[PDB]
Amino acid sequence: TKKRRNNGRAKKGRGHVQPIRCTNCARCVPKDKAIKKFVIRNIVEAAAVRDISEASVFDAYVLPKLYVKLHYCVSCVIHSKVVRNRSREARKDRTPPPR
Amino acid sequence: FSEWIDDLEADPKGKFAQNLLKKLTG
Amino acid sequence: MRAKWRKKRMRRLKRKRRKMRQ
Amino acid sequence: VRMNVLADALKSINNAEKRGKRQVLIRPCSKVIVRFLTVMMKHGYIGEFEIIDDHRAGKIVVNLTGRLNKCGVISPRFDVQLKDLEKWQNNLLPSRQFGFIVLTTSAGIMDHEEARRKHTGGKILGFFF
Amino acid sequence: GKCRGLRTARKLRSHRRDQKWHDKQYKKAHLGTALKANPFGGASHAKGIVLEKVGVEAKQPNSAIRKCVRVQLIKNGKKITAFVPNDGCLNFIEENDEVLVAGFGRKGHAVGDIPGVRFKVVKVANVSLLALYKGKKERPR
Amino acid sequence: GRMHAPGKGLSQSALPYRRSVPTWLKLTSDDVKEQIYKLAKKGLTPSQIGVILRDSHGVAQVRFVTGNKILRILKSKGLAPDLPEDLYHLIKKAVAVRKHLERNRKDKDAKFRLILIESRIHRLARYYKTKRVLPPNWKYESSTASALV
RNA sequence: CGCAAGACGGACCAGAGCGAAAGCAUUUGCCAAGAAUGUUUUCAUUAAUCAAGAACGAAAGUCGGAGGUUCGAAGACGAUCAGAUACCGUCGUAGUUCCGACCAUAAACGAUGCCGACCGGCGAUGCGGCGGCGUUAUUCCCAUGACCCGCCGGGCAGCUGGAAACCAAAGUCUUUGGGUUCCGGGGGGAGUAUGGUUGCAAAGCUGAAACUUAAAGGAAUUGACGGAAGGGCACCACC
RNA sequence: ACGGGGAAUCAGGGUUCGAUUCCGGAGAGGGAGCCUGAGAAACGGCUACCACAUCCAAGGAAGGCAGCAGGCGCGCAAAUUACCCACUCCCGACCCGGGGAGGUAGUGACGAAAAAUAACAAUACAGGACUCUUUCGAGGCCCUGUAAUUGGAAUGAGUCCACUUUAAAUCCUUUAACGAGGAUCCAUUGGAGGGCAAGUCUGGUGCCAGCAGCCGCGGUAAUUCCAGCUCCAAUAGCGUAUAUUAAAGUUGCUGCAGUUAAAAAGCUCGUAGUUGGAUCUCUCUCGGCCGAAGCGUUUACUUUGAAAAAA
């Protein structure tokens, strides 16, 4: 039967969507179907901040950030536990997790 | 009536299933 | 059998049959 | 496109009565539509209605009483002879006590009882009960 | 949807007659291939000469041996397997004696656990199998 | 909806209930007709004539003041085009897309749109041949389409 | 640090737009087209659907001509496993790119023909138009662009009768008739055989029967299982 | 596939069948050509070929049952080489002759109608039946029958009589002589798990034999097989096999379905096809209510009127 009303993708009112490659396996997944994360992390982990800050030439340097756009196929996104299977009623929820 | 009920509920799907259900009220 | 491979085997049989026929 | 405006008028009336509304807007108006509504109103099913006159094709605001179970059109307008009318009312009417079949006949548009009284067959427009 | 027009009678009739050919019984009754493939040639019974006796194994859920006879129909010279119905009735039948054979009751469909047998022996040696079974008559000398 | 497009638009003019000549219009029926003849002599199709009269001189509908439609007036005196305005514009659009197709033979959307325009032209020409606005042997053909515009 | 090739157009990019569908994303110019809105313009039934016919139609594939950057059917090797010549890794030929000619098939899908009415509500969003307090930007006399609040029209959506899953259409159906096209008739045999037709080929379109079978299948319940996820537990589990 | 009249369900609509006695057509083993005649391309007429076939003295001659009966053959499948012109009619020169047209018997389950196989005890019983006074107690006031002890009355199936019947006649009908108490003057066919009415009673068999349209019974306590008993269904009738109709709203015009069960063409143009918006209320003659005469723009229509064989 029809598991999802949008077929698990965001394709409405168009025929073809250019595919992208999963960041793990390089699987061809449509850009709307793929699961996209936008990681904005510190280039230095919170454990290594103190050493590089102490050894910094410039006081108040504010360390830069790593910006990465991660695309996942459904299989890799399930395996990496980014998304989980949800109940029939909780599937419909579109609100991102509160974090 | 009770004997038919006993025979039916002993083996509700065995060989003596359709006949007992029919004999119940028909 | 998977239907795609069933069709593929049928097509291969047809190709062999038409090769045998002149 | 919009063919057989009588079908649209009757469908609009039926849908408005299903929703319990007190008034329904029918557009476009037509001579056949007005005659059908008059036949309906003589039997107390539809109550008074008012023809809004715009200069192209009128509309009709039809008051509604909850007295109409169903109003329907018959397409195509089959030519029904007086000997074959009993079969048509057996097919279309809920019982012989009530319900009407509207025929357009050489004597005008009227129910099947008037068509039998006037000994006129014609073409079936629709039915209501 | 279906066309509802005062002048659609040709379209309606042509569509109905074309769609009737997608019906199993209509096609088997009117196409003609079923009648040719019928061993009886469209008859209800047929007389044949018993080619041999044979035992067929019943379909898996129930186990037995059905005592059928391979006969050859006189009219068209076809080979048929006909089920001798009752018990000990195969003893009433010998080799190369004419038997009247009818259908099995399912119009060419095999009946019961018997695989691929759609005929039953009705009469053997011009005397009914029922009469032999009930002892009313004997096999002619 | 549209006969060759999936859209279904409600946009179109809405004539008021009153059919009378408006109060603001002092321009008499014969003066309106004279302006119509001057505009048509300048070489304007009935649609453009009506647009100009409604915009600048000010007329609700020419049919309300003069009693006849603009194309009918032009025919009555006689300055109307040999072939109807809408058919002529459809033929011109077909000619334009055909001329574009010569140096853009890889344009397969222009080919589809030309087919649509030619289907519209054929439908309109059939209608006009029905009503004697066109001769019964009037054909639309690419080799002579530019001869009519 | 440069230089040369091809390929591709990230982030912006969205249940957003356009297109008949296939499909379409770097700037600019040219060419032709298009919907929607506005319209007190024009014609005045010119219309809806469609046998036949026709245009287009992903990828792959075929035939010629350019170029081989990457990836890569086939193939050659390299790897625990009982066995890859499978999944993994390294190479790698056709192909992947463009220009002509074919091919006309996809889970070509919304598995939902098109046109026309009627049928609840809501909040958004795209385009056009209308109305309006206020804040922003081009000299201090305005429109206008960006916001803000509504309205109307069209559009992809979202939310809140059916066997049921579900659907504001899959509703207005035993209270059964708006118009029209294609199309199905238990499961296999079988989209097979054969005939016709198209094609360079692959193959496409149209398409049975003998025979066989009492089920196949749809939706949902309960359990059991899952080399599925989450949370707990046991020295008949481990550490 | 000879056509039609017509035959099989009735919800309405329909779906099939019509070789078959009535009306047409066609043919006489297959073709063809003819004579005579008002009428034939006739075949119970001819001619000659093709295929079969009959006598022969081997020179020749004669053929046509898809007429009536009968044979052979084919097949699942179909009657006795009966009597008669008495009826119906036909033919003829005819009141008179002839008619396998036709009639009347023969042949059994084509089928349809009607309709036997029984109607009435003292008796003990399982009962009950209007206020039963008692579980130990009036029960032909009302009814069913376990019956090795019963009784009268009725009658036709049958065999015979009278020859009514009919063209001798068997036939129903009629009258009469015999003709019933295991009224032996003996009712069968198919079933008993469900569908679907009626036993988990007994004995045998032990996944065997077999039953079972379907689902399913049978692998030593079978409600299903084989038998006994008992019972129910129809009944002089029941079973079976194919065809067919309703069931089948599983062909859907009435009246189906096409998201996921089978299914919407990949998409859009397109001619035929189907469908299509509002809108129209001294013309005419004999006597100061009449036949004629109608282009009202032809229609589809409705509703009358003749004409639509008979069965």
Side-chain angles (χ1 to χ4, degrees):
Chain A
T1 177
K2 220 212 176 153
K3 199 174 182 184
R4 284 168 253 277
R5 193 221 217 285
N6 58 347
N7 315 334
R9 44 187 321 161
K11 166 185 136 178
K12 307 270 193 170
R14 67 209 41 102
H16 185 244
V17 182
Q18 57 152 228
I20 61 194
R21 312 299 288 276
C22 180
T23 40
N24 277 122
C25 45
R27 209 225 188 294
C28 253
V29 49
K31 189 184 161 190
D32 53 290
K33 181 188 210 75
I35 292 88
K36 295 157 285 221
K37 294 203 338 206
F38 188 45
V39 330
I40 293 144
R41 60 196 223 177
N42 274 309
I43 271 179
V44 200
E45 78 169 315
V49 152
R50 103 161 276 188
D51 306 326
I52 311 176
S53 298
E54 190 269 283
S56 209
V57 181
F58 329 94
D59 41 325
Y61 176 50
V62 51
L63 307 138
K65 307 210 104 152
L66 189 49
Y67 305 83
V68 185
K69 183 102 208 273
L70 288 184
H71 320 301
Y72 285 128
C73 63
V74 172
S75 321
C76 282
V77 84
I78 288 265
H79 190 76
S80 327
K81 280 171 205 251
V82 171
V83 304
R84 271 170 53 207
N85 56 67
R86 323 192 274 168
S87 49
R88 222 216 63 240
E89 54 117 353
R91 266 207 265 284
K92 304 225 269 314
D93 217 64
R94 294 187 64 104
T95 307
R99 96 226 181 212
Chain B
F1 202 92
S2 50
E3 313 197 276
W4 294 329
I5 272 176
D6 295 348
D7 311 335
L8 162 72
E9 288 190 82
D11 276 332
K13 292 200 311 200
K15 176 176 184 179
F16 302 84
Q18 297 152 348
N19 198 19
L20 276 294
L21 284 170
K22 158 73 201 190
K23 264 164 141 49
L24 282 174
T25 321
Chain C
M1 226 178 166
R2 185 206 187 142
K4 190 148 76 153
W5 309 145
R6 179 73 163 43
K7 166 141 74 163
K8 182 171 221 73
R9 158 169 316 151
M10 263 309 338
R11 288 158 116 81
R12 288 173 173 177
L13 283 171
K14 292 183 92 267
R15 265 205 274 201
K16 182 157 131 149
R17 205 122 67 248
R18 107 181 69 236
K19 171 183 112 141
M20 197 96 147
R21 295 203 38 171
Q22 326 291 355
Chain D
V1 284
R2 176 196 281 289
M3 336 189 174
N4 186 293
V5 292
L6 182 58
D8 305 336
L10 295 193
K11 185 62 92 217
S12 307
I13 287 170
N14 199 37
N15 295 12
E17 274 254 81
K18 281 188 214 274
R19 293 286 283 160
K21 307 195 173 303
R22 298 281 101 221
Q23 252 189 342
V24 57
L25 196 273
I26 283 123
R27 63 106 209 160
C29 155
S30 185
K31 279 182 311 178
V32 181
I33 294 183
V34 171
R35 256 73 155 71
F36 204 113
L37 296 191
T38 302
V39 168
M40 252 178 203
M41 184 202 32
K42 305 309 209 60
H43 296 106
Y45 279 85
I46 210 189
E48 267 166 39
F49 60 98
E50 187 155 315
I51 297 131
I52 290 102
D53 183 341
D54 52 342
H55 260 155
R56 48 270 297 162
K59 318 165 171 235
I60 301 184
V61 159
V62 164
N63 308 332
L64 292 169
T65 62
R67 287 186 218 200
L68 199 51
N69 292 285
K70 163 119 206 181
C71 53
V73 82
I74 295 291
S75 198
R77 316 189 170 184
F78 294 111
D79 344 298
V80 57
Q81 297 181 257
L82 221 65
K83 48 154 157 297
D84 298 85
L85 183 47
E86 179 242 315
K87 324 218 290 271
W88 265 110
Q89 39 189 7
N90 197 338
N91 281 344
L92 290 183
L93 294 180
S95 56
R96 300 146 48 73
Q97 314 294 349
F98 67 95
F100 290 100
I101 281 179
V102 187
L103 309 177
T104 174
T105 38
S106 179
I109 291 175
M110 71 219 166
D111 49 287
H112 69 263
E113 322 254 26
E114 232 53 68
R116 189 173 314 262
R117 260 188 296 268
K118 282 186 188 85
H119 216 69
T120 47
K123 289 150 183 291
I124 183 168
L125 291 183
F127 54 89
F128 61 89
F129 52 81
Chain E
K2 63 173 47 163
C3 54
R4 291 190 273 255
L6 224 35
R7 298 187 265 289
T8 51
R10 184 185 276 102
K11 172 83 162 47
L12 291 169
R13 178 178 48 178
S14 99
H15 183 249
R16 180 53 53 225
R17 85 161 52 104
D18 279 3
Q19 281 325 287
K20 272 199 277 202
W21 292 102
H22 291 81
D23 180 23
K24 269 198 96 171
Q25 271 98 75
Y26 180 89
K27 193 140 191 191
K28 79 159 254 185
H30 291 76
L31 175 57
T33 55
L35 198 296
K36 316 302 280 163
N38 199 357
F40 285 2
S44 34
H45 303 252
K47 271 172 185 164
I49 298 284
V50 182
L51 304 184
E52 67 221 40
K53 304 169 151 181
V54 71
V56 317
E57 326 107 283
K59 273 169 205 272
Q60 188 46 247
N62 83 169
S63 36
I65 297 128
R66 311 311 184 190
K67 324 282 146 75
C68 299
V69 285
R70 222 202 184 150
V71 329
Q72 209 185 13
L73 303 188
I74 290 161
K75 31 147 62 184
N76 37 27
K78 311 250 224 163
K79 274 120 169 213
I80 284 324
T81 173
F83 170 65
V84 190
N86 286 306
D87 45 358
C89 283
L90 190 72
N91 304 129
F92 292 138
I93 293 180
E94 283 276 16
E95 172 122 356
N96 271 51
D97 47 359
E98 25 184 29
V99 286
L100 183 77
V101 159
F104 225 167
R106 283 191 76 177
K107 285 83 208 175
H109 202 288
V111 158
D113 52 359
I114 323 195
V117 170
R118 50 260 267 284
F119 305 106
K120 64 181 185 181
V121 168
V122 162
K123 293 169 65 166
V124 54
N126 213 354
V127 31
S128 66
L129 251 184
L130 182 86
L132 303 184
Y133 188 73
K134 304 271 228 73
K136 306 177 150 282
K137 279 193 255 314
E138 265 68 29
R139 212 170 180 284
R141 286 182 194 86
Chain F
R2 318 267 71 82
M3 80 156 33
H4 277 159
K8 23 201 72 136
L10 202 62
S11 309
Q12 83 267 300
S13 24
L15 266 73
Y17 185 95
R18 329 236 298 286
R19 282 166 182 151
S20 58
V21 208
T23 64
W24 69 77
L25 190 45
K26 289 335 129 190
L27 199 69
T28 206
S29 139
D30 217 297
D31 285 339
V32 161
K33 283 172 170 284
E34 183 252 30
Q35 216 42 46
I36 287 176
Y37 302 115
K38 274 164 83 109
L39 286 178
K41 204 65 164 59
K42 201 194 275 237
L44 293 157
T45 40
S47 320
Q48 296 165 315
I49 291 189
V51 163
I52 272 156
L53 291 171
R54 180 205 67 216
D55 278 23
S56 303
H57 313 83
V59 300
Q61 282 267 339
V62 138
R63 211 189 68 254
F64 289 162
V65 42
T66 58
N68 311 307
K69 314 198 250 75
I70 313 193
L71 184 263
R72 186 144 313 180
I73 294 176
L74 296 185
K75 260 143 50 171
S76 302
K77 179 125 172 172
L79 9 152
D82 42 331
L83 91 171
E85 172 227 332
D86 47 352
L87 185 57
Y88 145 84
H89 277 112
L90 269 165
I91 287 203
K92 205 207 55 133
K93 192 184 310 156
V95 159
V97 309
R98 272 194 163 284
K99 177 196 149 190
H100 163 82
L101 255 173
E102 337 166 316
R103 29 157 299 259
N104 295 88
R105 200 186 21 72
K106 248 281 212 203
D107 197 338
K108 286 188 270 215
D109 194 32
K111 164 181 226 168
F112 181 79
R113 294 284 127 74
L114 162 67
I115 290 162
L116 298 200
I117 297 156
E118 279 178 2
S119 306
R120 235 135 52 223
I121 284 168
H122 287 132
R123 299 157 80 119
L124 200 48
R126 156 183 64 195
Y127 159 68
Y128 275 135
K129 291 204 313 275
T130 279
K131 289 245 172 239
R132 270 154 211 62
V133 197
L134 284 193
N137 39 59
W138 192 95
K139 319 251 176 316
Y140 167 80
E141 64 218 353
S142 330
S143 51
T144 84
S146 38
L148 302 160
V149 173

